[PDB]
């Protein structure tokens, strides 16, 4: 609910909404237009009887009922399909704890064992570590 | 450059060269960026100064 930023003394008629459209609205379609709705068979372009403006106001005052308050509505649309991920959740990090058996989930690789300091010569682009037989051996700390 | 499953990848490496132009000495080549382009790359063109 937004009764503080969409309301004030002496009233406010800033917002608008449409009740008279030639047809229904396709999902995710914007219909920004000021076209007078036709009534009967007149080509009337104006305001008055049988000649209605397409959009009306959402006049807001700090004193209404609950069903008339200026609710702030935000809808989040997502695409959960087979496509490269670009926006996603806050992956959480923890401490390290060296020289101790521990389950590790470094940046998506999961395994078990003991981790400690090393003297690799890791190239800056390098992220993983392996051996002759393709087994994850050394992991660079993503936060250190 | 390549566009395997999208994910445009660019690998760059700068060598001061020798008196020749295209040398024969080996020069490893390191990645620089990889971003999810996901478009049908078919044609290629360069820009001049």
């Amino acid at each position: 609910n937004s009764n503080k930023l969409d309301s004030k003394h002496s009233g406010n008629y800033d917002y608008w909404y449409r009740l008279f459209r030639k047809s229904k609205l396709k999902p995710f379609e914007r219909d920004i237009s000021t076209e007078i709705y036709q009534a009967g068979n007149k080509p009337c372009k104006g305001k008055g009887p049988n000649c209605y403006f397409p959009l009306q106001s959402y006049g807001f005052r700090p004193t209404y009922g609950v069903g008339h308050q200026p609710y702030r509505v935000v809808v989040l649309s997502f695409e959960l399909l087979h496509a490269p991920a670009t926006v996603c959740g806050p992956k959480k990090s923890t401490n390290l704890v060296k020289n101790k058996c521990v389950n590790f989930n470094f940046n998506g690789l999961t395994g078990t064992g003991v981790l400690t300091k090393s003297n690799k010569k890791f190239l800056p682009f390098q992220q993983f570590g392996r051996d002759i037989v393709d087994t994850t051996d050394a992991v660079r700390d993503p936060q250190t | 450059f390549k566009n395997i499953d999208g994910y445009f990848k660019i690998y760059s490496k700068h060598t001061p060269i020798i008196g020749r132009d295209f040398p024969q000495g080996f020069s490893a080549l390191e990645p620089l960026v990889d971003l999810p382009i996901g478009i049908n790359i078919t044609r290629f063109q360069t820009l001049l100064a």
């Binding site: - | 295209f22 024969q24 020069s27």
Partner: peptide
């Protein structure tokens, strides 16, 4: 303008396929 001369690439243009460190 430009030319279309052809030259031999020799041994050239090998990049790191992955980011996994190796040695020896």
């Amino acid at each position: 303008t430009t030319t279309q001369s052809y030259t031999n690439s020799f041994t050239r243009g090998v990049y790191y396929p992955d980011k996994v460190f190796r040695s020896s």
